[PDB]
Amino acid sequence: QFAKPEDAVKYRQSAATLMASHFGRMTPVVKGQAPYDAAQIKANVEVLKTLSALPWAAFGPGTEGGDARPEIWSDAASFKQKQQAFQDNIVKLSAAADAGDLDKLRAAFGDVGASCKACHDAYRKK
Amino acid sequence: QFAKPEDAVKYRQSAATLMASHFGRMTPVVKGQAPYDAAQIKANVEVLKTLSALPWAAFGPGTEGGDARPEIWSDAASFKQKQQAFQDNIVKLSAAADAGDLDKLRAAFGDVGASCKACHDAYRKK
Numbered sequence A, B: 001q002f003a004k005p006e007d008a009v010k011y012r013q014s015a016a017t018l019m020a021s022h023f024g025r026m027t028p029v030v031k032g033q034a035p036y037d038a039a040q041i042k043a044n045v046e047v048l049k050t051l052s053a054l055p056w057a058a059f060g061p062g063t064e065g066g067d068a069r070p071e072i073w074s075d076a077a078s079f080k081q082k083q084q085a086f087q088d089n090i091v092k093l094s095a096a097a098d099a100g101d102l103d104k105l106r107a108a109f110g111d112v113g114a115s116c117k118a119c120h121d122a123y124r125k126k
Ligand code: HEC
Pocket: A009, A012, A013, A014, A016, A017, A019, A020, A021, A023, A065, A066, A067, A068, A069, A079, A082, A083, A084, A086, A112, A113, A115, A116, A117, A119, A120, A123, A124
């Protein structure tokens, strides 16, 4: 869907920006600094679910640019491992949210965050 | 969810960027220049549905900035009219996509695009 590689870069960066907001805005809730409204979090995690599937299609071959390492391309099976583990942790977060279980939400939130960071540490330029 | 007004600006601009890609990537299909796969379009319109709800919460009071006119704030009931008409046209696009009806998809796509443009013409800086 991208006329030039730059358009893929702008897409994936925008998708990432939205995931960071929908993930990070839950920080006060999982820390207990903001109230836990199970319906609010269920709805927010549904948005994050949708967003979480979007970046990966915007790293097609030859879309080197942005802060994307060429190893995304030179080490591709491993990159797919990191995005599928991340998406699998998003499924677990959805399950915790859908269950209305705050302790499980805390734990699942942390697993997601660790997956974000593991991919960045390997595949995102400093 | 925004620590400073700039963060709301960056969010709404990123949401807009993603809607432009998910809307605009259908142009070749509605023109007949790319094949029409009803399931592909249904899935894409579901993504656009989700995205289409996101910008509006990132124009809270005092989030003047970006290319957002202060009339979004000084003429607020009218801005809400333009975002609800747009969201209502997204419902019609969803219905056309879910029905697998290409002629209806063409027509609904055009109505959505006109709603985007009408809001920009009134409320987006040049
Ligand atoms: C690999 C499988 C990743 C996972 C999982 C997550 N992110 Fe990511 N992110 C990744 C790359 C390769 C890049 C660079 C993209 C580019 O071309 O520049 C990014 C970038 C971001 C950014 C910065 C966006 C920008 O505005 O430039 C953010 C804020 C970000 N990523 C957040 C984020 C979050 C919150 C994630 C988990 C919920 C997450 N990423 C996962 C690769 C990967």
